[PDB]
Design a protein around this ligand. Sequence first.
Ligand SMILES: O=C(O)Cc1ccc(N2C(=O)C(O)=C(C(=O)c3ccccc3Cl)[C@@H]2c2ccccc2Cl)cc1
Length: 123
Amino acid sequence: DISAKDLRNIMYDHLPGFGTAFHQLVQVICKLGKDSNSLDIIHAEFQASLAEGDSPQCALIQITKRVPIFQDAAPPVIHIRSRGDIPRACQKSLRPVPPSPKIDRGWVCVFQLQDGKTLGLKI
Ligand SMILES: O=C(O)Cc1ccc(N2C(=O)C(O)=C(C(=O)c3ccccc3Cl)[C@@H]2c2ccccc2Cl)cc1
């Protein structure tokens, strides 16, 4: 059975650059997918979108809209030390956190810093 690590690697293989907001979205998809035993359907939706000609970025977004565990779901809160622990390619995608962020509206995750600061990662 496909593991979260393997799915991450498969999805990363299709992405340009590294440590981008789409890479973090892969991590969030794999994490929530693993916790809901849904890695198989996520992988199948990913492959199906690619096979139709969608960009890998669009395929990842379509997963957040097509796989029921992501529908109307809040972004995971991720505790970190400083803004530095966030990858360089994500820095310009960080925003103040909106009242009710949703993954299927492009809010990938909420980073929670040590001092109480919080930032939402937006696609
Ligand atoms: O393979 C699995 O069993 C599923 C899995 C487990 C952990 C990760 N993560 C990391 O290893 C990691 O560094 C996570 C981050 O989102 C992160 C991104 C930047 C800085 C610090 C962190 Cl902790 C990231 C992570 C950690 C906590 C909550 C959500 C996520 Cl995506 C992803 C998938």
